[PDB]
Structures are given as structure tokens and as C-alpha cells.
Amino acid sequence: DEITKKYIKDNIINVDDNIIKKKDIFKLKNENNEITECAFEYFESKKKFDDDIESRFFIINDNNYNENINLIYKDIKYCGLNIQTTGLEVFDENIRLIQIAVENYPVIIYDMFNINKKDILDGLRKVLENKNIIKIIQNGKFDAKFLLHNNFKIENIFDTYIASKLLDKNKNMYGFKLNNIVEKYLNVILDKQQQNSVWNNSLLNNNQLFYAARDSSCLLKLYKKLKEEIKKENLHIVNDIENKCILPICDMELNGIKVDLENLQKSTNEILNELNIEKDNLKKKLKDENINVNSQQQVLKALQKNNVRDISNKLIENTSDSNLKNFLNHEEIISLRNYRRLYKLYSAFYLKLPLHINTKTNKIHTTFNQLKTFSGRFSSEKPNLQQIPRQKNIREIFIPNDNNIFIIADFKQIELKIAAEITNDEIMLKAYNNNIDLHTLTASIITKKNIPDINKEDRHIAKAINFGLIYGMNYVNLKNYANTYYGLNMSLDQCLYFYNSFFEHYKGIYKWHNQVKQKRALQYSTLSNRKVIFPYFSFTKALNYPVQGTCADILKLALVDLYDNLKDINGKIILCVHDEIIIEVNKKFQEEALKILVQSMENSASYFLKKVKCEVSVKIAENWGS
Template identity: 30%
Template sequence: MRDNKILMVIDGNSLMHRAFYAIPPLSTKKGIYTNAVYGFMNMLFKLIEEYHPEYIGVAFDRKAPTFRHKEYKEYKGTRQKTPEILVPQFDTLKKLLSAMNIAIYERDGYEADDILGTFARIAGEKGMKAYLVTGDRDALQLIDENVNVLMTKKGITDIRIYDEKALHEDYGITPAQVIEMKSLMGDSSDNIPGVPGVGKKTAFKLINKYGTLENVYAHIDEISGKKLKENLEKYKAQAFLSKRLATIIKDAPVDISIADCCYDIPNSLELKELLMELEFSSILSRLDFDMKSESEKPDIKRPKTVINIEDASSLKDVLSSIKAGDTIALLVEDDGLSIASNKDRVYMVPITHNLIDMGLNYNEVMDILKSILEDRDVKKITHDAKKLMVKLSKEGICLDGVYFDTFIAAYLIESTKEKYDMAQLMYDYTGLNIDRVDASDILILYTAMKHILKEHDMFTLYEQVEHPLITVLAQMEIEGFKVDKNILRELDKEFTESLNTLTSEIYDLAGEEFNINSPKQLGVILFEKLDLPVIKRTKTGYSTNIEVLEQLQGQHPIIDKVMDYRQIMKLKSTYVDGLLAVIDPEDGRIHSSFNQTVTATGRISSTEPNLQNIPVKVELGRQIRRVFVASSDDHVLLDADYSQIELRVLAHISEDPTFIEAFKNNQDIHARTASEIFNVSIDEVTPEQRGSAKAVNFGIVYGISDFGLARNLNISRNQAKTYIESYFARYPMVKEYMDNVVHEAKLKGYVTTLMGRRRNLPELNSRNFNIRSFGERVAMNTPIQGTAADIIKVAMNRVFYELKKRQLKSKLILQVHDELIVDTHKSELDEVRDIVKTEMQNAMELRVPLVVDIGVGYSWYDAK
């Protein structure tokens, strides 16, 4: 009698490997790696939703050798070792499956395939429908009228269902012939030898004609081809060995009971706590779990009322009820603006241009909203206030009174996230699972986030640094930076001519024309025609990246030409063609976006275009700065740049007296370091020694290794090690700081800047050496680089608000790394110079002075 219920058996090892390589490394705040487990779980739920199995079992390989290894010790000998950060994830998965009441099967001496095979036999005996889930094509031999294989083809999302028909369509064989084919052609993935010289086509031809391996040898005299026949005869034993290795057994001594595979995922505290520990919020959501424990749940309710504003009168009534001192939440949505003054009611205001059908006039709506949005006495809580400020400025509205921004708060709480989606934040910080968030949700999120900021000692950082910076960055975006198109066109012409000349020279040196921009064609020229030594290979051929070209310098004149060509091509495409494409046609300015929530260190970044990435180490790159000019003939650009701010922060944090003395005496810190390292007087320091000392100084800030320093200076690793040891011998308290900060970070799980900015470091607990070393470098660097970021932000705030307070015409328009640029009215130049220097140098009190270098010019190039 046929059992209509469905059995699903999963090859745990296969799916875990698929998930591991499909999903980038993920780790919890405690450093537990979870990407493979997370991928597996998502696949599991997808399978459950699509196939509705009543029974589920998961099979795993064991570490112990199998009967196949005992018969052929080279079996699977070519397999790569399981990645170190994947190994512990198997135990994590098994623990999770157990908590979900999903049966696990494994047995020493047997593979997961054999357990799948045993299940397939039992399913057949019971007349059950069975799905075997794997990425291993060996399982295709198990297909029959009851058993289908769900084959993961790519990553964990693409699945092909194989029954006998589909197998024949794709491979032209029957399930039984899967074994016969492998016995002849072997299998490189499992290191099954097969018969040398017999490939897929030959194996298919033989099996298609004779059916089985035994029948092939029964008709050996009929087989044409001298070499083929010789190999078949010579390697007969190997062919039958291969058949035994390739055959999945169906009677593994595993205690299998279909009834045990009947699963019912419990709503248990054990499962909930494990999912919370793994930070699997989306899976908790699938299972309808609340992220918070009962004691943690805030006393919150979803809004009871959503009111759609459909006419101007209603809008006026709503806004007239909002008084000075009130707190409201604002959120821009796809089709309007939601406004809430409490958690129980939200008003939806349409602000699209197409409002005629609703009896509303767009300009009228904006005029009504303006009175509230520009009222600084009405406190506004929102998500991504800068974006809202920039958007409203285009409508002639200057948003004021912003009190709290959940977007910025989320970034401070967890600075390494890629995005800060409102719905996910609601789930993470309040336990509410909301499909569509509105302004009332922001009020709930605000309460939770303010509490966490205070708990992490970061509320002062938010209030005094990050929050006022929102307005600064918004105004910088709105103001923009004027660009001289004529200079851009001149550079375009100059770069084009240079590229044409270099192209001709490269063709001459190569002896033929080819596509210089094609790594494949360039590789053929360099490593085949010119016979240069191959440094590195890729999947598609030879590597010709910058590291390879640098190693080939001096071996052929074509290398320098290609490097120059690439540099100019990048400058032209990125900064000439790219800038021309983003100039605002109305004001002739570039309005870059300044991002406050992107870098984990606290640094501000810019995009569309990235003005912080304009190359300045080469003269051609610096020429790009000529394009950026003052807003008018009555203005000049004032460029103020901190001098060696990170080294000064390091001196302050480490309290090293020798380091501090050098800065207090206004010495050339690189020459002083060279003097200490090379044991010579400062007057005797050579340019080469100073350059090496500079590399050591900045390398120490970033936790550089002797290997990294050796590569940077093109010296031996032993010499680099000597430099670093000499540095720490002269500055022992710097070494002490480096050791202490890593030790404390391992204990706490995070590091902080002088102003309390926190960065979590789960990497420090990794078993993987490279990942753990990365965590240690970040632990050393973050307090330094992060403090420098805090200082420049404080300086930006002070300069911006002082210019505003004095009602000057001069505007802060750009921040790049440690540099501020003010578009300065000529009549205010002396006053602005004094403001900028004073505010920057006093942004934070350190044990060493903060020094600011100031330049003035019509263009950014001239000012710098």
C-alpha cells in the first residue's frame, strides 16, 4: 500500500559547503561564524515551503575513514581541506537541528550518500515519495519511480528536480548507468580512477551499447580501437574497483526509522535563545518568535489609527494641533510623508506632484507643511534626516528642529552593518515584525535606541558630534562645489593625446596592435610573445594587475608604458568623463553625497562622485583639482589640513614621552623617527632613511607586519622586522599601547575612540589566523583613526556653526580625510582663516598640539 506522505533527506555536508561558498562570511557579535548555517537554514525553509514534507532527515559524513578509503586509500584524496571557519559551523547546525526536532543521521565508516541510499530503499519499500537534497551527482543513481533528487546547481538558490525523465534529458542515461559511467571514466571530484584514456564520450558510447561494466568486458573482443581495448584490459581491476567506489550502498547499518523523521518545529525557549545567539532575526521571524525575552519586551503597541489626509483643510487641522515644544516623527515614504505625534496614530500626507484627483494642490500642501517643518521649536524625530533636508531644500523648505535621527543612532550602535533598513531595525531593537513602517514606528525605535546609546556611553557622542553634523553635511551637499568645464575639456584633450601617444609606443614595443584594456590580450603579449616571467595566473589566464606589473618593472620598457596608460585611462574615465556627467546643469556645481554611516572607523565618505578618492600622489592626478574652483570671482578657496593628525593621536594615547617631545618641539617627526631607528643625528638623516621612517610611522598606526612593511619598502622581511623592533625599542610605550588595546578588546569584544565611538570586533575570537590578525590590526588602529575622525567632525561642526553665527558669506563646502575647504568671500578671508585655524586646532585637547596648514587659491589645486 502506497504511503502518500513525503520524505525529504538532506545531504548536510553537501548543502553546508554550497551555502558556505554562496554566502559571504557572517559572524555574530561574539565572533561565531554563521554563513553556512544561515544559508542552510534558508534553504531548509524554502524546501519545506515548496515541497511540504511530513518527514525530514539530515545526513552527515563522519571524520572517520569509510569502507571506500579502506579499499582505496586515495579515495577523495584530491579534495581540499574543509575551510577552517566552516568546520565549527557543522556542530552549530547540528545543535540547531536538534533544537528544531529534525532527525540527524551519521555513522562511522559510511558517507552521507550511503544514508541517503538507505533512506531511498526504505522509501521504495513503503511506497513513499522521497526527495533527496544534495549537490553531489552521485545521488542521481538513486532515482526511481518513488525517489527524486533535488540537485543544487548553483549556490543555494538554483535547484533542478531530477526524475528518470529529467536525468535522461540532461545526461542521456538511466540512474543505473550513473554507476557504470563512473566505473569507466572515473570521477575527479572523488578521485575515483576509472580507466585511463576513457572520457565521457567513450564511456557513454560503451555503456549505451552494452549496458553494464560487466557486459562491456563480456564483449571486449568486439570493441574497436587498439589503445582503448589495451587500456580496458590493463585496467580491468581498476574499473571494477571504481564501480564499487561509485556505488552508493542501500543497507548502511544506521538505525533508521521513518517515524523518527516526523518533525514539528517547537516554539521552545531553547530554540529561540539559540537563534537569538546566532542573530538569525529573519529565521526567528519565519518561526513567529519574538526577538525579546519577556523581561526585555518594551510596553509598546502598534498604531491604532492610520488617517489618510485627503484635503488641505484636514492637513491644516492636523498641523494646527502641533504646538511649540511638541515632538513629532517624520518619515518619507514612496507615496508621501507620514507624521506621528504619538505611538497610536499616524497621518499619511501625499506629497507627490500628482495630487489633482485628490483635490489637493502640491504647492499648497508644501506651503502648509513648511510652517511645521521650518519651526525649530517643534522637535522632529526621523530616519535619515540629511536625505530629508536635501529633498526638502529643493522645495524651498529648510527643515529645522531635528531632534533625533534613528539612522545615525543605528550606525553608532553597530558601525559595521552594510545598511540600516527601518523594518530590520524595528525587528532588531524592538522585536516588532513590521512589513511597512511609518512615522509612529520611529517613536518606538527612538526610545529603544536612545536607551542603548546611553547604555554604551555614546549618547554624548551622538548629541555633540554626529547629530549637529547632519545639518553640516546636508548644507555641504546643497551648496556643492563649482567646476570649471573649460579646464575639464582641456584635461580631456591632454589625456586623450597622452593615451594616443602611449598606445602607439606600446604597439611598437609589442610588435603588433592589440587591445591594451584586455587583460587576456595583454597577458599573451607580455608572457608569451615577450616571454616575461609569469607572476600570477587567474582562472582565465595570466594576471596583469598592478601588483604583477610592479614586480615586472625594469624587465621591459613596455611595463612602464602600460602602467602610465592605465593610470591616465582611469583618470580620464573616472574624473574627466565621470565629472562631466554629474555637473548640475542649473548651477554648474557638483553636489556630492556625503555619507555619515558607511565607514566603520567613523570617517565620512563621499559618493556620486567620490571626491575623497582623487589621486594626489602623482602630478597628473593633482591636476584634476584644477577643475574645482571658487564659486565666483569674489571668492577664493581656503584649504585647511591637519598635519599628521593620526600620529599626534597615537602620541597622545600611548603617552610615549619621546614621541610627545618630538611634536611639542615641532620636529620633523619622520626625521626624528629615522634618527631613532638608524641611530644617527637628525642632521645626518638621508631622504631614503626619512622615507623608510615615514612608512614605519604610518605603518605602525595600521598595525603593519614585517611582511607588509617589507613589501611597501621593497626590502627583506628581516630588515623590515629590524626597523619595527628598533621603532618599538625607541618608543616602548607605543608597543605597550598596541599590546594593551588588543588584550582589552579581546576581553570586551570592542574598542573605543577617545570620544567613546565603539567598534565591535568579533574577528578577535576567530579560529582563522588571518581573520583574527585582521581583528588585532583593527583593534590597534580604530582608537587612533576613529579619534582622528571624531576630531575632524568636531572641527567641521565648529567651523560651520561659527560661520553661520557670524552670518558670513563664506561656506564650508568639502571635507576630504583631514582637510576642510571653505569657499571664502575675499572680504572675509582673514576672519575665516582665523576661525578655521582656531576651531580646528582646538577641536580636542591632546598632550601634543594639533597643527593646521592653510593654503588659499582660486582652484583647489592652487589652494593645496
């Protein structure tokens, strides 16, 4: 039909009319700073949209290309960037459209599947690569991944999703989509009713492209309002750190971590054989061949039948971990706990990892979020690399690529040092400046011994108590935390003495607790001014948000600096979990990468914390579990 092929030469198919090809004379400055009149071709919606957002759009392909269109990019400061892709997986999908939105101009849509002259993208590469031009994106991680994977270099970025998330102060988890944000801040409905229309086809319908253009032009007005809103709330530091942390995260996701298939198979066979042996032993002990070991009620009934009792001659009724500890003087329950451990490992990690390794490259690629967590720390999904077992044997599976070497660096006592800085405790700072660990100090003041005499067990009691009480746990509740997560058995009188002694000397933390509990404020802030508003008062969250948020800020600034400092030796950032950062470098640059990483982490720590000097433990490792 002639109506549907009116603009087929530009790879546009007309569905419901509502499209007109119009030519107008534009005014632009030549490279020599001379106003040169140029005539372009742009498409417009025949039926005007009720909103004020821009809807005109160019389309640049192999034939329609005009050399003077690059004059739009000259002497700009912000540009709206949005890309449409054939699918979500970066490795199995290509980029369909690149969209650049420039103020008081139509959006420029690059038809990637119909571009073959590499000079067509010459100006796009410069406008993306320039550090003085701010690129506005929605969910910038996705677009940055897709652009970097396709040999585009992107340097500056301003994610409207990040600004919207920070401004809401973690009040709501859902929302924060382009329609929601634009409705909230501009009072305009984008009509995002496109149900993920077909993009793989070379021809694209009218409504698809007009939805694409309005999703890009609206980012300029959102930038204008959100910049002022961030400046008003003094969130510019956190916003800048987060925006610059997009590229490190995308680099981590693209690089991934390699998996040794041979060692993985060997470990899987060994663990499965051990599981079978333990299952047979438990079957013999439970005296029920048909019993399903995994069934909770069945094992409860079996143990009840066998009549394993307490020291108080009390029978078990729940197989929770805390309950199982009380009953340990029988072989049956020991075998049951061992089997539970083995089964948890086998069914959580070994059998689940092969679903995540890509056979095309033999690597695990993770999805890193940076604002879903309440504290602000990174969170990983699909393969939850934070949920990997911490045992040395398990982590030995992960290895660097061929002809490379890992460099693992992690902070020491970062939460405690941040707490000392924020609360301004007189004694903690003076201790740290003399090179004594706060765990050692806590152990010494508890045990009344001098610093040299502290053993490892006292250090362990200190490790429990310091993390226990800094976040406001009551002395009664210290028992459960100590026994559950460290195995120490403590008498409540001993806990009372520990609490009194701990808060008698560290005056700063006591004053901090008193102020936070007296004020009962609903708004809290970190040292990067990342603000959060809780629905109601929560003492533990109140005392925990500042330190952990500042730790997240320190790690993010470290990644931002490290990504720039590693470009000389082609280092690859692989992972960032807890207070740990992993980078792979070639074996020739083994020595320099260590100094680069140490300097980056130390500068990041010293930017925020000023009283205390942070130290980093770095080791050159052949594999993760070294």
C-alpha cells in the same frame, strides 16, 4: 463612485473603504496658558490595526486649515518628523507631505501640493527651527536635504537610523530600515508593503496616507527605547556628534563643487592625444597591429613572444604592478606601464566625470555616507571624490563659484597624534609639545643624526615606517608596504634593525601592542566611545580602529562647529575627504574665514585630545589643486 469620492474635498480618494472622518473635542492650552477647548477633524482606520502604534492622522490643506492646530506644538520636547517626496533626486523632485507626530496626538500631515497660504506653514517653520525641540527622523540626511533645499530651516535632529547603527556595533551591514528597527525594538510589524505608490498625483489613496502616518508615529516609541539604550551603552557623545553632523553633510551635498568645463575639455583632449601616441608606440613595439592593448592575456602573450626576461633570465607571466617593477630594463614594458597609467586616468576620471556634472548648474553633487565605513570616516559614492586622482593638474579642474575663493584646511599627522594620546607614549607627547614632527623624530632615531640634519629622504623613510608599524605590521611585512606604496627598497636585516629600534624607544606603542595581543578582546572603542564588535580577532583592525575612529570623530565635531561658526559670513562647506575640509567664502571675507576654520578645527581637536595640541595647515586657494 460615491464611495471613492466621500472625502474628495480633502484630497483623499477611498480605495478599499477603511477610512472614517470623525470629529472630537480636544483640550489644548492657549498662548496665554488657558485651557481652550477646540474641535478638530481627523481620519481613522475603520479596521483596527493589530499593533499599538498610532494610526489617526489630521490633514492640513488650503481650505481645511484651522488656526488653533498650532497649539499642539507648544511646550513640546520631541516631535516625529517624516516627509514623503515624489522621487529621490532633490533637484528634480518636490516634497509631497510633511508629517509631524506629537505624543498622545494624531499625526499632522501637511498636503504640500494643496497648500498656498504661506501662513499655514508658519508653525511648522518654528517647530523645525527651534533648538529645544528634538526632531526624530529615519535616514535624516534625505529629509534634511529636501527640507533645506525648499527654504525650511531645521536645527535639532535625532536620527533613529544612526542610533540603530551605533547600537549594533557594525555586526551587520544590511538591515537598519524602519521595518527592521521597529520589529527589533518594539515587536511590531509595520507592513511596509507599499511598492512606492504614485505620489505625483494630487489625490492620495487611503493606504498610502495610513502607511505614512504609522511611519511617523512609531518614531516616538523608538526614540524612547533608543535613548535609554544609548545611555546604557554610553554612546551619547558619538550619537550627539553624529546627529549634529547631518546638517553639515546635507549642506555639502547641496552646495557641491563646480567644474571648469573649458579646462576639463582641454585636459581630456590632451590626455586622449597622449594616450593615442603611447598606444601607437606600444603597437610598434609589440609588433602586432591587431593586438588589443587592453586585453590582459593578449599583452602577456605578446611580451612572451618578444621574450623580455628577468635579471635571472626569467620570462614574465603576470602583468601585476608588483611583477612589472621587477622587469624595467626594457623599453617595451616601460611603454606598457605608461599606457596603463594613461588609460586608467582617461577611463576612470575624464570620461566618467561628465556623467556626474549637472548641466543645469555645472556642478558635481556627491552622496556622503557617515556610518558605512568600518572606521566611521565619511565615504562618498556616485562620484567617489576620495577616488579622484591626487595629481595637481587633475584637481585644478575643480574651482570655486563665480566671485568666491576656496579655503583648504587639513590636519597634520592626526593619526599619529591620536595614537600618541591614546597609548600615552612618554616620548611622543614630549616631542610634540616642543614642536617637532614625529616623522622627524623617527627619522632622527633611525639615522642617529641630530634633528637639524634630517633631509627629505630620511623624512620619507620615516613616513613609511611610522604608518607601517603603528598598526602592527610584522617586520617581514614592512618590506612589501614600503616598496609598494612608497617605492623604497629595503633589506630584511635593515627592516629588523628598524623594528627593534622603533619599538625600543617608543615604549607606549609597544605596551599597547602587547596588551591588545594578549587580551584578544572582540570589542573595541574609540575616544568618543564608538564601539565595534568584530566576528573574530584581527590584530591590524584591533590596532587601527581606535585611531581612525577618533580621527573621524574629530572631523565630525569640526564640521559641526564650523557649520555654526560660518553662518555670519555665509560660508559654504563643499567637501570633506581624508583629513581635509574645504569651504568657499566670498572674497571680501577671505581673511575671517581662515580664522573661523582654524578655530573650529582646533577646538574640535582639543575637545578629545588633551595632551597634544593639534595644528592645521590652511591655504587660500584659487582652485583645489593649488
